[PDB]
Symmetry: D2
Subunit: 111 residues, 4 copies
């Protein structure tokens, strides 16, 4: 139930393919390459499915010298969702290294 | 460069290949598949190179039902360093989700 | 505006007073974790925030020791108050447990809490 | 072992007093660089060699300056010769709703008696 199109509440879109080898591949909409990993054999006791992915914010058109990683879980059901916390790291000089990383969270629905 | 064998303070071992257009692939070590991305065209001003990667903690011997993502930057220097912050998420029930995610930091060197 | 009784989405209660010195004092009751009854909190807040529609930065700490139990840990919430039709305090938290050096790598939990004046 | 003066490696200092029941009060630092702190610590920690859980907050406003922000530090004290306080922090800035997603920085810092 992870494969498909997911939306957060701020207009972002990601299209992911969940591989039988536990790979997560896809696109984060401009448009960037996404890549990560998920638990391909989760428990069936009500627990969600742990997963994570990364996007580096460079494509053919632009480059923000930064990258975001999302760490969370997939919860299936009537209203399937992916609940995440993220770290967004920017390339800084070592003087500014303490202020390099933002932390936040985001929920995705199949909306 | 980024490509190489890296070690953290706790003795972990991280083997990466940095690809031509932003891919990170390799193994984390009990050896697990990692995947990520990096800024393939960083600043020329002394800024570091932003990157991130994910490991899902299942292999052909163990499954902890959890995933860790690392977000950081590569600093090229006399000692080349990769400085990160990580999020380790565990599959929980949604009543336990509040204690699902650990946060910490890690520094890798080629030594 | 911050002074009042606040509840999170889990049923916990946050009774606080915002003083004029930027101080925050009060009591926290958690609905989850190793805890029971009330614990003391203290923190700080921006007593003169920007006029441009931004919110009010604040933070506080609870050490989870009271007369009923000791979880050997503390939590800090960091966030901002947003005054509006639906007044709300949005935070992120760090919960640190005392550990030995060996497991300090797993001493800290991070999550996010939203508080509202209506339960 | 907590009461006193602590230093990080980026040229910052805090002076704390740890009161008998888990209170922490002090200053984070010239006058224009001085700010008030307050937090709590576990006043009856385990004797198993585990550290002492603590946390504190500084809002970045004093009599001269206002950064419209607050940092909370969450961590543990470890006694001994190299007495250390190991923390992770969260630094939140007041933003607009639109930019709340970029309001909070996360990082780590270590404090020593020397």
């Amino acid at each position: 139930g992870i494969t498909g199109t997911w939306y957060n509440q701020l207009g972002s879109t990601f299209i992911v393919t969940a591989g039988a080898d536990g790979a997560l591949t896809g696109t984060y909409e401009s448009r960037y390459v996404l890549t990560g990993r998920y638990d391909s054999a989760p428990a069936t006791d009500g627990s969600g499915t742990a997963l994570g992915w990364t996007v580096a914010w460079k494509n053919n058109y632009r480059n923000a010298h930064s990258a975001t990683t999302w760490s969370g879980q997939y919860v299936g059901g009537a209203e399937a969702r992916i609940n995440t916390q993220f770290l967004l790291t920017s390339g800084t000089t070592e003087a500014n290294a303490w202020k390099s990383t933002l932390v936040g969270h985001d929920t995705f629905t199949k909306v």
